[model samples]
Target: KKDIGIQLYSVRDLIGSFGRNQHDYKPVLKALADMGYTSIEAASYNDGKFYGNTPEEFRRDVEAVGMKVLSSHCGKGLSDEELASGDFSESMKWWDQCIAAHKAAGMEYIVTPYLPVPKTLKEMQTYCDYLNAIGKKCREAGIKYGYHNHAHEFQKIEDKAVMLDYMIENTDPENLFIELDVYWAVMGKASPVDYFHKYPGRFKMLHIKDRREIGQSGMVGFDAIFENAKTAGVENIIVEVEQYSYDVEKSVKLSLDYLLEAPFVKASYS
Candidate 1:
């Protein structure tokens, strides 16, 4: 089966408040578990440690809530300060530590979630080189490394080229993979189906999200997106709820219901 998960970042508000004891996470996890969610992508590693809890303690808490932690968002590779201080001589420093920590937590992928958009093709090429170096380090550590995209990547850098194309071409597929976020790709006006056809087996993970209908020329049907996803050779699909503007739990259940009942998705996994 294609395992489905939630990016806990979707519930950042809940986590923020729960940390303050204004609410608890147990009930939330129970609801998600009952909804048939078998795994979760953790959003915080620093928070628990900042609050005096160890990584193992945090993992235990997640397990106590009855959900498995399959992956996590680690700290950014190099912050502005560290980069300025020259504390990180190479990008490998970040990946080496992340791989060690992830292995300790029993996680598989070392996912880089964001990169600042480059202003020029030259800058974009430089950034891609850095990413390739990061991926190589992860490969040496015996773990998969991947990149996540946002809307800006699809914006045209020149009359005939785009940033996303540059990134895909520059990165080494053997050491690097992609985690395509559905909502962002559509927002950027690119056909997910086209990319899937262009780069078969390069996408190891996906962010399964729905876009809200603003008006004409702005909406794509969920059925089309998910159906295309199956044809794209997606290995893992993460259900991410970002801006529902309604009851969060209700929104989540509704999305889950659609996926669970969709014949195309169900048949593909079977």
Candidate 2:
């Protein structure tokens, strides 16, 4: 797909090791642009808080990198007390603030990166209802809201895969969409392709990375990953190479080369 991009989290270590000073941000972004990356998903703003940038600066910095910011991850919101003591408010007011921040940044999607751990089926339903409410608000705000899956969501509860199925059924598809992290789906043993067939148009974005079984932990394999994308109805997949010790530039460049040369998908501008 021509809309392909790289999730900045793939190089979190590189940013952590070298991006502490503000001066390091531009060069790091430049490096990705030179590697043939056309789009990016920002994990951090110039202010360093998630979605904390003012509208003007967020746009300027992204343009400086020769890339477009497709979307960004907003941490789950909590109450004022929660903000002070680690609890988050599921209140509409908090969501308004969060959604407003992203709207100001000119982002197409507002992503909830994690869910609060629910203890019971009833509790999970409560969270789903809350998400349903939030999903509606996102529509009013003129933005598409989505959830990013982690392996935990796949755990069966109440004789059902409650989290996955409930989200698909309960929320309004007009506003609610999903960004499947393929690795996590694989970890949960859920077929990414089945979801693609099951929900024809729900998937709009993805965190594209690969895992190789090599004795202990998994490694990245671009070939198998591209195959998975085809079956998944992936609109635009972002490369995310997590926790590898090799050079980030080299690995990312190799990934782009493979993706561009892969025979299965066609590349063209929209």
Candidate 3:
């Protein structure tokens, strides 16, 4: 009944500790698994490899540590020229390899964690179209695709069109999904539950985070979000600690402890 996952990007510094360029992931991954985090959302994916290892290799290592890799944060959005011309053939080709690698890893989902922050509604539409294309390919490959948001997505683009709303409205629901970052939604002066109610099942995961660590900020209405987890179509909770009050390992442990003990947070979101 335990289904807590964590994004590895939260501990980039730790990867650096062992030597970022060519470090061993076994130690750090094992430590996280030992702390009761059963799943991982990897961040280092490039040239069809995750954290310098092939998808098959990375999955083997993670399984060796007794944890599953549920998802990954990856996506090389359109280049400058592509954005200017709106021809995304190159980016789509890139996704072909990316999609194949993640499938080899047995990942449940793939997420694009950032964008350039569209300045106009037209630019936002290009992004949505590109995302939808990627999503379509992943769907055919049998892996779900999603977008991760930051505070920027909540701001307005040209014509006072809200970025988040535009993307949600334009994309095909069957092709793309949203992985809402709760902390950033609150940071953007938006309520997580409100979106949950307005668009039921649009989101498939919640990026659980805080200003410092989970539950310490007291600024996030996590309890309410948890209350509406089902409505949000949350399949998993991904803990991401970008800042810390102590050593990262200790802080991550505390984050899990907080969630595991919370009455509102579920023991499992399978």
Q: Candidate 2: where is the Cα deviation over 4 Å?
A: 16-23, 45-53, 77-90, 212-233, 268-270
- For this target, which candidate reaches the highest lDDT against the unseen true structure? 3
Q: Tens-digit lDDT track for model 2 on 33-80?
A: 887787877676433344344666766777787787677776554444
TM-score of each: 0.81, 0.80, 0.96
Superposed model 3: Cα runs more than 4 Å off: 17-21
Candidate 1: tens digits of C-alpha lDDT, residues 129-214: 66777777777867677888889888776544687777888888867777887678988987777888887767777777766211
Model 3 local distance difference test score: 0.89
Best by TM-score: 3
**Residue range with the least summed lDDT across 10 consecutive positions in model 2:** 212-221
lDDT of candidates 1 onward, in order = 0.66, 0.66, 0.89
For candidate 1, the 10 contiguous residues with the lowest summed lDDT are 212-221
Candidate 1 regions with alpha-carbon error over 4 angstroms: 17-24, 47-53, 75-90, 158-160, 212-218, 225-231, 267-270
Clashes of each: 0, 6, 0
Q: What is the TM-score of candidate 1? A: 0.81
Inter-residue clash pairs, candidate 2: 78-88, 78-89, 79-88, 79-89, 82-87, 212-219
